[PDB]
């Protein structure tokens, strides 16, 4: 019973750690979408997607 509860706690901790690792992977592979603007600058695109990801 105690060992089963310890294993359940470890499983929950592993689930939380896996979710944090997934978030880390998303936020170190995520990059800004740059679009050229009349051969002067590269402006950022993807505002709704970036804001939705941050909010989620």
PDB file of C-alpha atoms in Angstrom:
ATOM      1  CA  UNK A   1       0.000   0.000   0.000  1.00  0.00           C
ATOM      2  CA  UNK A   2       2.735   2.446   0.998  1.00  0.00           C
ATOM      3  CA  UNK A   3       4.918   1.296  -1.908  1.00  0.00           C
ATOM      4  CA  UNK A   4       1.928   1.656  -4.248  1.00  0.00           C
ATOM      5  CA  UNK A   5       1.315   5.210  -3.009  1.00  0.00           C
ATOM      6  CA  UNK A   6       5.019   6.006  -3.467  1.00  0.00           C
ATOM      7  CA  UNK A   7       4.845   4.666  -7.031  1.00  0.00           C
ATOM      8  CA  UNK A   8       1.717   6.743  -7.727  1.00  0.00           C
ATOM      9  CA  UNK A   9       3.456   9.877  -6.412  1.00  0.00           C
ATOM     10  CA  UNK A  10       6.488   9.076  -8.579  1.00  0.00           C
ATOM     11  CA  UNK A  11       4.222   8.582 -11.609  1.00  0.00           C
ATOM     12  CA  UNK A  12       2.574  11.963 -11.035  1.00  0.00           C
ATOM     13  CA  UNK A  13       5.971  13.623 -10.629  1.00  0.00           C
ATOM     14  CA  UNK A  14       7.170  11.946 -13.836  1.00  0.00           C
ATOM     15  CA  UNK A  15       4.072  13.208 -15.666  1.00  0.00           C
ATOM     16  CA  UNK A  16       4.693  16.770 -14.461  1.00  0.00           C
ATOM     17  CA  UNK A  17       8.386  16.539 -15.394  1.00  0.00           C
ATOM     18  CA  UNK A  18       7.511  15.201 -18.855  1.00  0.00           C
ATOM     19  CA  UNK A  19       5.059  18.060 -19.397  1.00  0.00           C
ATOM     20  CA  UNK A  20       7.690  20.600 -18.317  1.00  0.00           C
ATOM     21  CA  UNK A  21      10.205  18.962 -20.669  1.00  0.00           C
ATOM     22  CA  UNK A  22       7.691  19.188 -23.524  1.00  0.00           C
ATOM     23  CA  UNK A  23       7.182  22.885 -22.744  1.00  0.00           C
ATOM     24  CA  UNK A  24      10.972  23.347 -22.707  1.00  0.00           C
ATOM     25  CA  UNK A  25      11.262  21.628 -26.098  1.00  0.00           C
ATOM     26  CA  UNK A  26       8.524  23.834 -27.567  1.00  0.00           C
ATOM     27  CA  UNK A  27      10.119  27.005 -26.216  1.00  0.00           C
ATOM     28  CA  UNK A  28      13.666  26.212 -27.298  1.00  0.00           C
ATOM     29  CA  UNK A  29      12.603  25.109 -30.789  1.00  0.00           C
ATOM     30  CA  UNK A  30      10.189  28.043 -31.209  1.00  0.00           C
ATOM     31  CA  UNK A  31      11.475  30.939 -33.305  1.00  0.00           C
ATOM     32  CA  UNK A  32      10.090  34.215 -34.611  1.00  0.00           C
ATOM     33  CA  UNK A  33       8.626  34.285 -38.124  1.00  0.00           C
ATOM     34  CA  UNK A  34      10.347  37.112 -40.018  1.00  0.00           C
ATOM     35  CA  UNK A  35       9.010  38.536 -43.292  1.00  0.00           C
ATOM     36  CA  UNK A  36      10.922  40.984 -45.486  1.00  0.00           C
ATOM     37  CA  UNK A  37       9.384  44.468 -45.724  1.00  0.00           C
ATOM     38  CA  UNK A  38      10.305  46.273 -48.974  1.00  0.00           C
ATOM     39  CA  UNK A  39      13.958  45.144 -48.702  1.00  0.00           C
ATOM     40  CA  UNK A  40      14.406  47.263 -45.557  1.00  0.00           C
ATOM     41  CA  UNK A  41      13.696  45.012 -42.567  1.00  0.00           C
ATOM     42  CA  UNK A  42      12.368  41.612 -41.500  1.00  0.00           C
ATOM     43  CA  UNK A  43       9.135  42.120 -39.571  1.00  0.00           C
ATOM     44  CA  UNK A  44       7.602  39.603 -37.175  1.00  0.00           C
ATOM     45  CA  UNK A  45       4.633  37.498 -38.294  1.00  0.00           C
ATOM     46  CA  UNK A  46       2.573  34.891 -36.464  1.00  0.00           C
ATOM     47  CA  UNK A  47       1.046  37.056 -33.738  1.00  0.00           C
ATOM     48  CA  UNK A  48      -2.110  35.061 -33.012  1.00  0.00           C
ATOM     49  CA  UNK A  49      -0.181  31.771 -32.929  1.00  0.00           C
ATOM     50  CA  UNK A  50       2.565  33.136 -30.660  1.00  0.00           C
ATOM     51  CA  UNK A  51       0.076  34.745 -28.261  1.00  0.00           C
ATOM     52  CA  UNK A  52      -2.074  31.595 -28.209  1.00  0.00           C
ATOM     53  CA  UNK A  53       0.955  29.436 -27.382  1.00  0.00           C
ATOM     54  CA  UNK A  54       2.040  31.794 -24.583  1.00  0.00           C
ATOM     55  CA  UNK A  55      -1.491  31.957 -23.147  1.00  0.00           C
ATOM     56  CA  UNK A  56      -1.948  28.173 -23.293  1.00  0.00           C
TER      57      UNK A  56
END
